[PDB]
Glycogen phosphorylase, muscle form (Oryctolagus cuniculus), 1620 residues
Amino acid sequence: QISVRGLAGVENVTELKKNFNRHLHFTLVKDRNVATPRDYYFALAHTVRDHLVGRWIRTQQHYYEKDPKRIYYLSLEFYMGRTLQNTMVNLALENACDEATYQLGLDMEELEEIEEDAGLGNGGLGRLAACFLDSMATLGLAAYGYGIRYEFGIFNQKICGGWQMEEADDWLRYGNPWEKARPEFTLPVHFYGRVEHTSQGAKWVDTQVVLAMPYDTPVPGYRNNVVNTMRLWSAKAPNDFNLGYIQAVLDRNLAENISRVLYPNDNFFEGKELRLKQEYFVVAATLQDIIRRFKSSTNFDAFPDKVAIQLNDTHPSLAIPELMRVLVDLERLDWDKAWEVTVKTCAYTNHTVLPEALERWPVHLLETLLPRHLQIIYEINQRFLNRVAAAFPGDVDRLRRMSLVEEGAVKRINMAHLCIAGSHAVNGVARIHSEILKKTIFKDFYELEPHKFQNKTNGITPRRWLVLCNPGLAEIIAERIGEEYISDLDQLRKLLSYVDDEAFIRDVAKVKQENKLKFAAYLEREYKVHINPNSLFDVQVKRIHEYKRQLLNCLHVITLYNRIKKEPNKFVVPRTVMIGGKAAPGYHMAKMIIKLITAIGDVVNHDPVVGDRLRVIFLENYRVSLAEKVIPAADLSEQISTAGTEASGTGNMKFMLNGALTIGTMDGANVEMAEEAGEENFFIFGMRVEDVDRLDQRGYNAQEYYDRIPELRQIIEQLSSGFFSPKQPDLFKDIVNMLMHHDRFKVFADYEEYVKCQERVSALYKNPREWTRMVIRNIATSGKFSSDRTIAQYAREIWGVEPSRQRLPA
Amino acid sequence: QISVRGLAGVENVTELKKNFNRHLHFTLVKDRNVATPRDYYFALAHTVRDHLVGRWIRTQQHYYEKDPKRIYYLSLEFYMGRTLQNTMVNLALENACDEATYQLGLDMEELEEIEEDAGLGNGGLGRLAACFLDSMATLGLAAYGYGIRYEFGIFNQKICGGWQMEEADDWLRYGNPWEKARPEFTLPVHFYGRVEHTSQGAKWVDTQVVLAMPYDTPVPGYRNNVVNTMRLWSAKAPNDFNLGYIQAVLDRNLAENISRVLYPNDNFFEGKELRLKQEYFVVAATLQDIIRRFKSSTNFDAFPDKVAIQLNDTHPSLAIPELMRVLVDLERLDWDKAWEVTVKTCAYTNHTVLPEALERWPVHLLETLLPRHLQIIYEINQRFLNRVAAAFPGDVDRLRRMSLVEEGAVKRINMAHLCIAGSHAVNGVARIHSEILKKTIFKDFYELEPHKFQNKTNGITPRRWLVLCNPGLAEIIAERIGEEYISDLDQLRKLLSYVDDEAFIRDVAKVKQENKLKFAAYLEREYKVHINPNSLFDVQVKRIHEYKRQLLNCLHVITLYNRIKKEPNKFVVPRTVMIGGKAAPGYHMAKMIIKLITAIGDVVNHDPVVGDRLRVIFLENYRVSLAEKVIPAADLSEQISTAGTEASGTGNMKFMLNGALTIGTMDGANVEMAEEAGEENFFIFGMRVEDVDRLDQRGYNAQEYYDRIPELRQIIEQLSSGFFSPKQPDLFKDIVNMLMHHDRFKVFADYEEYVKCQERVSALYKNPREWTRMVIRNIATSGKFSSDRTIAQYAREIWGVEPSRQRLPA
Ligand SMILES: Nc1ccc(-c2nnc([C@@H]3O[C@H](CO)[C@@H](O)[C@H](O)[C@H]3O)[nH]2)cc1
Ligand SMILES: Nc1ccc(-c2nnc([C@@H]3O[C@H](CO)[C@@H](O)[C@H](O)[C@H]3O)[nH]2)cc1
Ligand SMILES: O=c1[nH]cnc2c1ncn2[C@@H]1O[C@@H](COP(=O)(O)O)[C@@H](O)[C@H]1O
Ligand SMILES: O=c1[nH]cnc2c1ncn2[C@@H]1O[C@@H](COP(=O)(O)O)[C@@H](O)[C@H]1O
Ligand SMILES: *Cc1c(COP(=O)(O)O)cnc(C)c1O
Ligand SMILES: *Cc1c(COP(=O)(O)O)cnc(C)c1O
């Protein structure tokens, strides 16, 4: 049907049909008379996978022969989502598969919906890793993603009586056709034990062994025949483990628990032993694999010329002392040479300045679990502080602030300090964030080693986040400017020539309308609720967190409700306010916010005076597959974090690419988005970072705003008095108490400006032609936010490799 | 090369090569430059599996269409061994695969050795189930094997310092290409809870749910295109299980432990809660599957016409009360109708009379775990004893003896009594055993219901146990009498015509010699030990147990050693004495026997005066794959259980088919083997059952034998004084103490006759022509011991179905 989906040639379609029937019979062991849609999904998945294999084998051979510098991206999270459609897009097979399935009497879109998300991340950090893998393959880099194969990914969210309930995400129940187990490359990982000092150095002995078994998943680049690998480790007990007999076998679970479950925290550090084991497990297995590959190309001087290790936050920070351990204890390099190699190999990306998110591990945990690593960390620290002392003689307080070891009731290791000391490059993830790092939390380090500090503004892959999820928009763009923009997103600037083109204005608005109808239908089918598709779709989807200020959105929703109740017969621009996201299971306030949102919906959605002018919907189980549905349908993107708290954001970019306008603070990448589009084409409001600092100096007093803003006082009185919870009048007292007395994120301080700015949104929505023209100006300037741009900068400025757009042979 | 391996046609070989290369590339994702022998094994396995699939699908369709009576064989154990070779044999693909692999530069015999045994049983009972499945498919019966997919099967045995050590049998580590997961047919199983009585009957409520996920394995018949199913259940937790968050996910292991590990006891009852859960799990999942299939053909009157359930010992005995539960509580049949259906559907096979092996479950365990089943058992008991009382009025002691409920310190349910009450047929597994059941432990039941009691003498499949493991023997037989004997083993009687044929005598002896050389080479390669292949191979392989009397064999070995030391320059017929088998991990005396055997070897094998005249080898890790190697190599089969203790034996039959002579007691199936071959062609010794009873009446006094037999006294003095354990002189005092004071199996009572009979063996071995003629008389009369004969009798006399040798279309 549509150009960007590729050709449906007669021979291709015939061959796909034949292989589909082959897999149904031989692989699935079904006949067509008892096959279900799930069987059909698997038959298609196996058919598409067969097209990856030849390219995968030959890509890996090519790297063996050419021996390029290899890039290892280490992350505890890879939020991959579904694989079927993405594979078809990247191999140009989508129209052919659609035609082949159609001729077999099947609807491919229905089959796509059967696939489970690979939910091996929490949100933005995990999803960034996934976009990065797609971009590294598209740019022809010899790149490997290394992580953990969690048996249970991010929990499935159910809403019961307006409250979040969690269910295990048993994503492997029906099998994963995309992975290949590689039990033959299983490696040992050591824990506990003790250090003994011989005449020939330190030896780590009496350890417990867990095996790391790798599973490989292919990562196809966009139409270049490159297929890279994501290698995820699974924990296995050795066969003599604990070897009465029956109990010993059952206790194998103790070792295998390492890879059982993803910790479900976003921007929060939970200092549990099992998490530390996960972090070491991934590092120890990965580094052995890296060294094996390097030796199969004595001379570790060339190691940083052949290897780059990128640390996705501090979660894999033990790579630094592990690399030292291997080089010093096992390869017998002198300390100084080993350190040189380590620093030149490793680079560190920071993704947050929130203090509760920074990893600070108690020394007693490391002492017990990883006694040799603790010794190495202490030695790193002493040598590092000797440099600080020579550079800043007599500055004793600087020595305390920069130490890797934090003193206190409990001594802790600051892993961020370790990463800076042991990396040749340190970057933040948007310009304002990278500046904040240099001015505040890493100021001392910046003064010592200014050359280490860089910025790499985040991005998103336009394959998944435009072509895959919004084919209608991709097509109308391609009609005007061709297909080259899909791997060169800067070409979208050519669309500025069509801002006054009546046909293009019409087509952009038509695509949005179609996406809105499709989404409104999805809601009725799967969740039995009726929404008005002519209303403005006002969307805030992201993890639930105080810093992201879902609560500020709630205050605006109640303000609109109260204004309608005050003047029921006045016209207002109709809205559907959609809020979705998961709360971490132990984060009480985040769970209370979800309950508030559903409670507001219970009042607003059933008030007959409101009608269809205002609807408040909580979108259940927000995840990558749901993002692909709701983002193309959105008119207004809510990006309303307190200035200085959202390091970048990436949902913001997804909305910009898909034809929503943004209401937001000057935070994270929002700043750069407004710069690219023009401030006149963005709905900017609220305190800047400098304003937040000024308020902190004076002291934030929320009572002042309550006393001065009658509309705000009314809302707080409604919350306190039980207007939104009649059977339990005190249900929201924790929320009220937080807002009035201990709000770290200054919700009330941005309320007035936010409401006023929302009024400007509504005014522009009344003029569809001007709304759509502003949309075009946003889509047209979204090019900078391609993860292809981001990865090219990492490649050239950190890893020392040149990207390529050249095709390998097919 | 050899006829019975089938044709290697040009098109067949070309097609196998092409599909092998396809699986190596697409299924395994390897190129030939880095493929290992393991990859080649998998590529061949997938290639052979593809030939099963069409036949499997069409066999199951055929049963759906024709709706024959279905046979459900319920077992906690299926000791399957390797699948690759057996599949090739049954599909007539062996020569073609050999040729295809040869042309690819690969040795198929080497690839066969890579496959793991499916070790989901302990010994004879589990292996009988496996032979039975092969025979049911070969006879065209609509049969299903139902069991548990243990993650860990029978442990791998290592010998360290002469002692058994156990290691987990991680048989699934590299994947199992033969099974197909069927997550779509997952069913719930309930545990714990309580019973409430409504006006509409009893309801079992507040239960914990575990899911049963089936995995299906194909079971091919011999060249008839029938492929039946073995369905094994695996335990999974529901996704809301225990649903802080992290611990709840980790605690899913509690539910999943049900299918984790095979209890490693042979002929011993261990009354643990986890075992009871296993037994109910398999029954509850299986019965739902049976009922589903029956309803997809209100009228349960036809249930016994469409369903037969065979209980493999009492291990699945909960099928009886579970079927009643379903019919009464869920389908709402009246009790009497439900009981009629149950009795006509179920049949019970007993495999042991040893009191320590009989399952007697404490009432308190059933009360907690399965409260509704305990109520049903009590009701069964009361109604059953009412019948007994009406038949034998006033016989109060009979009421006590026959009760399903045993009184005592702890009340227990006798599961064997339950099985008899609830089954229309009860059988033993050899004629003497079935007679013992009627005269001793089940005498009261036999008097009440004589018609229930039957015999079904055991057998072995001649596919695995002749054609597969001894192709050389199969071929020389086929040269004379054709190939029909492989599915009609009674045709081996035609070989009696060749007992005086010089060429046949030569060929039989040549095949044995070849098998002996091959086995002696296997020993040197894999276990660094040198044996004389001209010696008599004297073999006792079976689980280590006091009743099997490995100790009696040890006494003979020491007797031979002592006689050599007394008269070193006298000729004796050289022997290699091989003993192998696993001890249950908690069975101390069995572990001490293993140590004694290796200790005897340490002395005998290093005495220069002995030379190569006597060698004592402990065969490590005896399992199905090792049986297939050692049995064809054996000259003498040791079958020396105390009369009345081995219910049948099946190793005995394997040796008879493969050209070994038997030394044995008149126990189990040995009696029938001697009857078929003629007592003159069997080395029979020792007490008969009647002699054992006479000694028990008088009182067994082992001291009498010690006092009267100087050769025996010498051995006991050697054991006691530390001759076989110089560093630990008292190491064997438990063995000596048992033999002298509490030997339940009367080792000393059969010693003199055993030694004398062994002298007759040695005398016959000196005359190779007469030895070989006796061998021919044994092979020629082994036909009765085909499991095809056994299954035809079950079919006609218990299940009410007619076997068929007709081919389904290919
Ligand atoms: N456990 C744990 C789990 C996750 C995190 C964490 N830290 N930063 C992030 C997100 O990374 C994204 C990608 O750079 C940013 O766009 C976003 O602003 C930021 O909040 N996630 C921290 C701890
Ligand atoms: N846990 C457990 C596990 C196993 C058993 C058990 N009972 N009998 C047997 C063997 O069955 C074989 C097949 O019928 C007989 O040939 C053999 O003589 C007999 O000893 N195994 C009992 C308990
Ligand atoms: O010794 C070799 N000969 C040929 N190819 C090799 C050899 N070692 C590695 N390779 C190639 O590189 C491998 C990629 O996996 P790796 O071993 O994880 O790097 C294989 O897929 C081979 O194609
Ligand atoms: O409704 C039906 N139509 C056609 N074939 C069926 C149907 N139900 C079961 N079958 C056949 O029997 C099945 C065997 O699996 P079962 O459901 O476990 O008995 C399938 O393999 C089908 O070939
Ligand atoms: C992009 C994305 C995120 C990150 O959104 P932010 O608004 O930047 O926090 C989180 N979750 C999912 C499922 C995503 O696709
Ligand atoms: C046949 C067999 C058995 C049973 O042997 P018995 O001598 O009858 O006890 C036990 N284990 C294995 C591996 C077998 O093949």
Observations:
- The pocket of inosinic acid (ligand 3) is lined by residues A 60-61, 64, 293; B 31, 33-34 (CB under 6 Å).
- Chain B has two domains: 1-459+787-810, 460-786.
- The longest strand of chain B covers residues 208-220.
- The CA atoms of residues 88 and 556 of chain B lie 42 Å apart.
